[PDB]
Amino acid sequence: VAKLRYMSRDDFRVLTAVEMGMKNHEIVPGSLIASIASHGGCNKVLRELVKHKLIAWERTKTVQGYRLTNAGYDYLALKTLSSRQVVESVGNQMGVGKESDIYIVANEEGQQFALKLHRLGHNVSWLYLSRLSAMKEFAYMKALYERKFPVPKPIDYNRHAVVMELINGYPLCQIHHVEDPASVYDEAMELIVKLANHGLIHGDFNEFNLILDESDHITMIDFPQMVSTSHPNAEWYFDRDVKCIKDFFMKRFSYESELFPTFKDIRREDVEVSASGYTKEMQADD
Amino acid sequence: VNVAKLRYMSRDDFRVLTAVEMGMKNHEIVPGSLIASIASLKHGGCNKVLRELVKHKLIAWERTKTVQGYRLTNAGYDYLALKTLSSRQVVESVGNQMGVGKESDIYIVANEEGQQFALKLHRLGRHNVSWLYLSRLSAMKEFAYMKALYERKFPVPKPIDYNRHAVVMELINGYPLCQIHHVEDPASVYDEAMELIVKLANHGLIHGDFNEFNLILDESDHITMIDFPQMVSTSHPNAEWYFDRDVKCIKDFFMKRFSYESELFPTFKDIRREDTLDVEVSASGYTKEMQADDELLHPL
Ligand SMILES: COc1ccc(-c2ccc3[nH]c(=O)c4nnn(-c5ccc(N6CCNCC6)c(C(F)(F)F)c5)c4c3c2)cn1
Ligand SMILES: COc1ccc(-c2ccc3[nH]c(=O)c4nnn(-c5ccc(N6CCNCC6)c(C(F)(F)F)c5)c4c3c2)cn1
Secondary structure, three states: OEEOOOOOHHHHHHHHHHHHHOOOOOOEOHHHHHHHHOOOOHHHHHHHHHHOOOEEEEEOOOOEEEEEOHHHHHHHHHHHHHHOOOOOEEEEEEEEOOOEEEEEEEOOOOOEEEEEEEOOOOHHHHHHHHHHHHHHHHHHHHHHHHOOOOOOOEEEEEOOEEEEOOOOEEEHHHOOOOOOHHHHHHHHHHHHHHHHHOOEEOOOOOOOOEEEEOOOOEEEOOOOOOEEOOOOOHHHHHHHHHHHHHHHHHHHHOOOOOOOOOOOOOOOOOHHHHHHHHHHHHHHHO | OOOEEOOOOOHHHHHHHHHHHHHHOOOOOEOHHHHHHHHOOOOOOHHHHHHHHHHOOOEEEEEOOOOEEEEEOHHHHHHHHHHHHHHOOOOOEEEEEEEEOOOEEEEEEEOOOOOEEEEEEEOOOOOHHHHHHHHHHHHHHHHHHHHHHHHOOOOOOOEEEEEOOEEEEOOOOEEEHHHOOOOOOHHHHHHHHHHHHHHHHHOOEEOOOOOOOOEEEEOOOOEEEOOOOOOEEOOOOOHHHHHHHHHHHHHHHHHHHHOOOOOOOOOHHHOOOOOOOOHHHHHHHHHHHHHHHOHHHOOO
């Protein structure tokens, strides 16, 4: 774990100005950055930001200027989170999600958490989609957590960063021995039904998104592109997830079952409404 | 096939409908005062227009303890795109819906001469502001990749034009593979799908949703790819899993529907990398241009 690097308020203002300019521009010219930040002082700051790899300079035939980098975007989110006493130090990357990088972080007291940094996207698409990708995850984690789903407890959010409870477990893909394979297989299958019961289909249900703890309990850590059960082709997505689970257990643990669930028999009984509500609340702030 | 020309709308009404769209970019719900400012009608019958737009179900109004205002509806968003396409002579009439994509509704449309095309209307974002942007983005990505894939001789429809969340493309004379119950040579059709997966992987892409619903079969039993919403790069950390999943879906369908099995299915290791500037790079270039042109970035 390493403490965040120091930065002056002036440098932070320019870095923030690059981000603001990037909302509607693929490339931000030095002149615009100066206008937003409020000019050979500005150029000094830009030169320092390039050296630190927080921003990058680019030349194209139509326009030339700067853009935020992954590191620069990360710094904005982490500093904001640092200011809220949520994250003070960041460790190394332990893995990835479909659209994200996962890290370990610690607060002031040294209490550890999981940090997910979302990367999705074009420069303007990248800034917008990464932020949106994170918001959706935080919103859905919160909604799923309220209904006692096996997901981490969400702690905080900013931009493309999400901070959640850290599960003491490993991805199912790295697990080669389990106490009872039928037991874990059933937990996963029951999980798929429970999501369908609440109107959701994962769409990426696999050994990579499922984490197994010491007690062999499964926790869902990635849900980027879930499908509604109201979708015209919802059955196919449901069946695909089930087959993926069956495939993995046959390959890894040599376990088979003929009790595969069916989509039509699934009934409904709400997370999407709550999650959309949470998404709307968060959007008001940004 | 019932194709109907769009209903007429006055310049004033279109201006207000356009104003709601502009307002929706910064507001989940758009207040009336803001719409008037944006529309700026010379004589100020703004409230008159909005209620008619509400009556025609093009927009909807809401009040909450915290906020109140208007929002575009699916029909209203559709009207802006179609009216725009109509003025540019791309499409004059719209038929019935013939099917769906992962994030879209597919329709039949016709131009002035009565020539038919396929129209896709993208719906994504079930928040109001995300709905406005994501639908545009979904349409833009689709047009951009269709263009990039088509120029490289991929079996995809020819993209004609786009606006907002709408994409207009060549209409393929075929039906989705899920609806096909008899084929002259299933082995041959199976080969087309597998070759398509290899060709996409060779160009740095994995479909991620490769299925009977996304593949169209024509009169000569040729396959066309009509929906590719969330493709994965071959450089993705778990790309091999996604590649295999798509292959298994194809194998599964053919065993169930045609009782056909084969052992000549591709492997991820065999994939090659062509020119660095491949489909993704070309598609990204198109995406940047369309984003620059987006009407939200310019005055009315
Ligand atoms: C929400 O909590 C979590 C916990 C673990 C993970 C996660 C996700 C994908 C991973 N992919 C890998 O290839 C991998 N290799 N080691 N590894 C992993 C798993 C658990 C853990 N620990 C988690 C905290 N208790 C000690 C074990 C570590 C760590 F020790 F480095 F922190 C690394 C992962 C991984 C973890 C995600 N969220
Ligand atoms: C890009 O070109 C196309 C063409 C067809 C399609 C498409 C996609 C999903 C569909 N799902 C359905 O349940 C369905 N039922 N009929 N139907 C269909 C297929 C081909 C066609 N035609 C295509 C043009 N020549 C005459 C047949 C029609 C039409 F009669 F309405 F034009 C309807 C579809 C469908 C088409 C998509 N893109």
